[model samples]
Target: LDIVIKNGQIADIENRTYINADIGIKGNRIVDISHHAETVIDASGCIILPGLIDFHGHVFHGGTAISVNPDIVCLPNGVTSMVDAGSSGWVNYSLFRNSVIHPAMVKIKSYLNVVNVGLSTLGGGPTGYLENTNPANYNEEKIAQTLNDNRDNILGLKLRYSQDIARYASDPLLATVALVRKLETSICVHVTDSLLCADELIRYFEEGDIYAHCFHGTGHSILNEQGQVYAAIKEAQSRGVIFDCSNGVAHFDFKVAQSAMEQGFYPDIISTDLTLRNSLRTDKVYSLLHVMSKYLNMGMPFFDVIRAVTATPARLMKMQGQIGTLAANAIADISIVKLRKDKITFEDTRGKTLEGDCYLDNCATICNGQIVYRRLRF
Candidate 1:
């Protein structure tokens, strides 16, 4: 054994139960704790979980203006791997891979941005106002080449169809759906303030396709004025279209989240659409654990919230036992968290606040058998 954790309540997603056991880390894999090790840490009251996987985030730092530094923000909050939501396009993906992905200590993957430039013009970046969703910006030949060449990095296609981003155009959505259909790969679409309606948007979604920003209380969102989840969205979700509550700086609403969830519409993935500026703020982009704690207070159930970030995301990435499990021979990436009782207030992107009693705080994070982050404990 290279490392060992004792007396911890390990969240066993394999069995969907928390078992009192010790964990042994042998090199880069987790083995049975029936062995001794150099680093013997007492977990005490902590809940040992599989290292969290943020299904959607932007981490093309230095490659894009809106993207953020990944490792600094990820490891501290128990996130070992994250899927960059297309911060770099087919043209610049090589640069992103060389600088951001290859050198990073955290495991990184991406939803290939369909646009040729890949979110370069977001937030008035170096370029002028470019319609990100316009079909003209999607170079089909280059996109196919990149996806074909980088099978390990590219998860699927990413398209943002918000009214302003797409200029309220219908062609982008239709064209993106066509491309996804042709490629036989899923797509992750941002739907905040979308130009298309819920059913109209969901009609093109296939199983494993992601409907991002699902809880945004904006035009053409998941819920209607009556505070009910749209029937079409519900049906699509039932049919396997993933509903991702990617709480970005301006893409989450407490009312929408609370309303839809009360109707039993739990998000399939809990992620922070974290960017550089948002990472510095306390409003919406707190941490992955903080966003997850909001759901815990909203009655999403502890196991459900954990699964949303861990097992469900792993399933989405098609890397289930490798990155998001604690089984023997699995990657020794682990998140040690403590659910503490406290009177805390959480704010949504809409400036609305919710009071919560329990918050999940990270105690330690282990990635590839090395402790990346650790907080003082008794």
Candidate 2:
């Protein structure tokens, strides 16, 4: 073994339990935990996990004004794998790949935008605007050709269904869904404040299609007038719709998320719709761990919260055993985090706060058998 993380509580996501164990890494692969290594980092009082996988994030970086550098934001917080959630389309996907995706150290994957110039003008963070997502602007040939050519990197397609961003009507979005079906790739639908009712919009999703931002406190919230989770939402989950908490600046609400979770409805993936303005050490949408701590405080069980960011998202992207586990011969990507005891407040998009007693704070990060980020200590 080249390096080893010693004496940390290892989370077994498959069995939903924690074990005091060691992790041995040889080169870029995880080896048998019982191996001896000269380079050992004592990971006392921390939870060792498969590196956190953010299912939805925006990392076009300098290519897009709203995007931010991936390694700068993700690595320090122990996120070794992330998906760029439709920051570029056929027209600019190549540029994005060359500029950010190719050079970044994190294991990068993407969902191409349905629109030709995906989110060109709509800046989620700094310069706020909306993208031109009308169906008339689509180039069918380029869309298909791009998908066919880059199926290895581009896993699926993305469509944002907010009323202000594009034609909020389900008709245009449904049309794109039809196109995605023909392409034989999955789709991730951003359904915050969609014009169509939540129930109606949710019906459009098939198995494996992502229901992004499911608990937004807006017009198209999954809740009904009675303030309970809708029947269709439950039905969608049962049929394999991957519900996601893409907690963007205005895409999450405490009331909706907590109530839904309490009622046996929980997100399959917990992600940060990270952007330049919001993720730059701001008061809101701070980091992936910040958002994860919120769920931990919101009565979500510890193991389930870990699963949301690890195994579940990895499975969705079809990189299950390869990148999201500590099994022998798997990738040597790991996150060591300490659960601190402190009184803190968590704020949602709607200015509501939840008091919490504990939070997950990254102490060290190891990617590819090397220590990439180690917190300062006296």
Candidate 3:
């Protein structure tokens, strides 16, 4: 006997469609998700998909300047999976693991910050803050070595191109990213207003590499006048590069997003560059799925949106078998999605607006077969 999720439209992203079925769980695995179960949940008129994975976020443990308790970020929103994108640099990951990972109920991995002090003490500023570029600074090689040593915990690498990280050297970000590729790891690059041109940076990423905040309208943006697509951005997509709508303080705009979608360069994945300073903007920045639903109004199908956030990023992080699908014997992480048709307005980092008729919400989340969070009714 276990627990059951009653009748619902099961979104099988792996197959790109929904099925009428029920899900059953026992212990921390899926016993049977079709028929027999111990207890049943009334899930009629909802969407059931594998638990959502946030490929980038910060887990608090004295690392990044804007860290959050893992539970607070994951459980309520049913984000059972998260990858800490450079919150901790190579030098401080051990402390981050002990303080954040060990105590976290949700599954979390790290893309160690390129800077030595991680985001804790240094917010990716000037070369001096890094571990070994110079005396008392960041060592790129050592960082790669640590990632190699702790392959289980370190998923890949992360670096920002804001003035903070690429200050001293003419090509600091380029050199750092080259090292990440040399180690055969993925890189998540944060492109800012003063970045070294968006199209120019996109040329650097190969398959599996991520370009967070693809829709920012600031300097170095991908958009041309009249909202035309840049050939480099289009080429990158064809080569399997992953584009993400990493909603953050300076990384989004409804105009850019709509233009990109119109040009057929829809975001490959959706993730919130979540930080403690801006949790309030989550629902407003629009949860990943909400952003997708907004595109649904633009003619993208519902299933495609589900795949971007669930299966696509999971595969990008090389966790397809582990977290993205409902494959038999895979992790029993799941999310209950509900549709709300209303006058929902979605704004971006630039305050541009797009109103839509429907939005998606995380009604409940089950991580590792355990009911971690469920919406309560009054």
Candidate 4:
């Protein structure tokens, strides 16, 4: 083995547990786990987990229009893999593919928006963006063509269906669903104030489809006035629906998340949903483990949180065996986290508050058998 990570608590999110172990790496794969090694780091009081995967983010955030450098946002946060949640639509996917995706050493994927123009504005609302499926105004054919051309990088389709934005259209979400069928991809619908209820949206999705930001504002989510998880939400999950925690400023409500989590209705997947607004202002959740720890104090266990950030999302992007697990022969990309006990206040994008007694610290991140980020205690 090339290097050894010893004396750390390994968060094997796949099985939802941790063990005192040493991970040996050679080339780019995990070679062994044992007590004896040529070189070892004392990880006695550490948490080693699968490098996280972010299923939603606006990584093209450096004001470059259609491009982004991944490592700057992902690696430091212990995210080995990231999925841009519809940052690029059909019109400029080629530029996105060539500039950001191809060159990125960090594992990356995306859910392309049905709109041809992509999310050009800061937060992808409704207006100023072209609707790819609107026969009255947009070109569905070109959008479909671009999606087909970049099938490898595209994991699903995305649409934001809020009444504030889609009031002019007769059926904004319906049109986008039609385009999803046309492209033969999973759907990621951002519903805040839509006429279509969350149940209706689930009708358009299959077992593998994703619902980003499921705990957002009213009129389109699973939360009823009683703060209970909706029946459709459970049905959708049992049938294989993937829920993403794209905890942007406005979407993640502490009450909503806590209630659902208390009922054991946790999201199968967790992501930053990091836009510029959330990144620079909030703690950025910049790292998945940080968010996981935040949720842990809110009623979740560490193992469950790890699964949400690891194997589960990896399964969604079809990179499970390759990226999420530390099983022998798996990629050496790994995240080392340390749990801290302290009174902490976590605020959502909407400025809601939840105080916790513990949180996760992203102590280190390893990618491709290389040490990429080592946290400094200052």
Candidate 5:
């Protein structure tokens, strides 16, 4: 064995259980879990899990204000793979690939923007505010070709049809969906203050489509007027539409989340829509661990929340057992985390706060059978 993590509570997210064992890794894959090895990491009193995967984030660093470097923001927090949620389109995707993805230590993939220019900037001009809302600028052929060209790295299509952007076009959402259908891939939709209601928007989704920011306190949310989870959302989940918690600035509300969970509707995946402004500047959406801690305090089971960050998102990305499992021959992406019982204050994008007695913090991160990040004290 190349490395071994000893005496940790291994969280089996798929089975929804925990086991006291050691993880042995060799040559970028997990070789065993029942034995010790020469090189050891004493992870006593910690929870060991498959490395976290963020389904939605902007890591196209230096390209846009919303973007940040994945290596710096992700690795230390045990995020092995991060999907850049539509930060670049076909027009400038090559620049993003060469400049950002090629050099990053963390595995970076992306959702191709339906718009030609992608999210180069946020609301600087008439068409700049929202890229796909202009009918004249809709380029389905280019988007399809781009998706085909970069099928390996481009995971899905990204569509943002908020009221501000949808108002500019006759039916921007449907147009974007048509492109997604033509390409035969998944789509991640942004649903903050959308023009269409949650009921209406969910009807357009096919199996494997992701409904991003499902807990936002916006006009068209997954909850009904009576503060219960909508029938449309429930049906969408039944039909395999993934509800993702994209905890971005101005998108997450504690009350809305509590209400949704009270109705027994939990998100399929948990993600931090980590942007430069929200993550580094405002310090609102800190890390994936912080987001998971909030949900754990909100009555979600630790193992279930672990699934949201691990197996669930990996399955959504179609990596499945290869990246999200600790089974033998799986990738050796691992995270050792500490669950502290100290009183911690949790805040949402709306500036509301909640008190929690437990917090999840990263102690070490391993990627590809190598130690990538470890706490200074460790």
Candidate 6:
């Protein structure tokens, strides 16, 4: 065994249960779960989970104001892999790859944007939003070629179906969805304040597609204006479409989440739409674990919350057993977390707060069998 984590409670995200066992790592893979080695780290009281995967976040640092450095924001919070949700398009994807993705400590993948300039600029005020919604800026042939060339890291396509795109684009949302279909890959759509209603937007998504910010309290939520869950959302869920609680600055609401959960609508994945502005500047989003705790406080079971971050997101990314599992022969991307009983106060994007009895704190994070980040006390 190359390394061993002794006496930790392994949250088996695959099987949705907890097992008290020691994990054995050889090289960069988890070789065994019930065995141990001589040199072992004591993890007696901590809960060991597959390293968290933040499914939606902006990590294209330096190139854009809306992004954060993934290594800084993600690793300390137990996120070993993260998906850059449309930070760049085919035009500047090489820059993102050479500068940001290649040198990152965390495993980085992305959804290529339909726009040429991508999210280099956002929201017409300062950085400028939506980078030309004109269909002239979108080249399906180039996008497909780029996606095929970088198939290893580029997961699928991304379309921001906001009011800006809907209002200005010649073809609008269907044009982008058609490109995604032509490529035969999944797409991730941001649906907060979109021109299309939740039901209208969800119908375009194929199986394995992602609908981000499903619980935003803004215009056009999955819940109708009357605050009831939409039937199309339920149908979409049954069709294998993933609903991700991508808690951005204005993209999550406590009431919206509660209303949906009350109607038996649980988000399949939970992610911190971690940006430098929100995560580092304004303190709106601190980390992925912070967002996970909000879901826990919102009444999601502990095992279910862990599975949302680990197994479910991994499956959506098409990397099921390669990560997000403590099973034998899985990658040794493990996170040691402590569920603390200290009274905590949580806040959502809308500034509403909730009280909770406990929250999760990262004690240590191991990626690829190497101890990457460990709390001083642990």
In model 4, how large is the Cα lDDT of residue 199? 69
lDDT of 5 by residue, 37-63 (tens): 657888989998888898899988777
lDDT of 5: 0.83
- Tell me the tens digit of each residue's lDDT in model 2 across 213-263: 988978879999999999998999999999998887889988899889889
Q: How close to the true structure is residue 73 of candidate 5, measured as C-alpha lDDT? A: 78
Q: What C-alpha lDDT, on a 0 to 100 scale, does residue 260 get in candidate 3?
A: 79
User: Could you estimate the TM-score for every candidate?
Assistant: 0.95, 0.96, 0.89, 0.90, 0.94, 0.94
Q: Over 4 Å off in model 1, which ranges?
A: 14-16, 34-36, 124-131, 168-170
What are the clashing pairs of model 6? 123-129, 124-129
User: Model 6: residues >4 Å from true position, as ranges?
Assistant: 14-16, 33-38, 123-128, 280-283
Q: State model 2's lDDT.
A: 0.85
Q: For all candidates, what are the clash counts? A: 0, 0, 10, 4, 0, 2
- Model 3: how far is 370 from its true place, Å? 1.1
- Per-prediction CA RMSD (Å): 2.1, 1.8, 3.3, 2.9, 2.2, 2.0
Using lDDT as the yardstick, the better of models 2 and 3 is 2
Estimate the TM-score for candidate 3. 0.89
CA-RMSD of model 3: 3.3
> How accurate locally, in lDDT, is each candidate?
0.84, 0.85, 0.72, 0.72, 0.83, 0.83
Looking at model 3, the pairs that clash are: 51-334, 63-120, 130-137, 130-138, 131-137, 131-138, 132-137, 132-138, 132-139, 133-138
lDDT of 3 by residue, 18-71 (tens): 788877777777655443356566787888888777776777546565777768
